[PDB]
Amino acid sequence: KWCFRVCYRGICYRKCRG
């Protein structure tokens, strides 16, 4: 239920883990 911003190589996405 935790959403964190993941930036990978400039690609940023809101990844929600749990």
* Neighbour-count burial for 1-18, b at 16+ CB within 10 Å, e otherwise: eeeeeeeeeeeeeeeeee
Contact predicate 16/6, CB 8 Å? no
E strands, the chain, in order: 2-8, 11-17
CB 4 within 8 A of CB 18: no
Find out whether 17 and 5 touch, Cβ atoms under 8 Å.
no
Asked if 14 and 8 touch (Cβ cutoff 8 Å), the reply is: no
Please answer whether residues 3 and 16 qualify as being in contact, where contact means their C-beta atoms are separated by less than 8 angstroms: yes
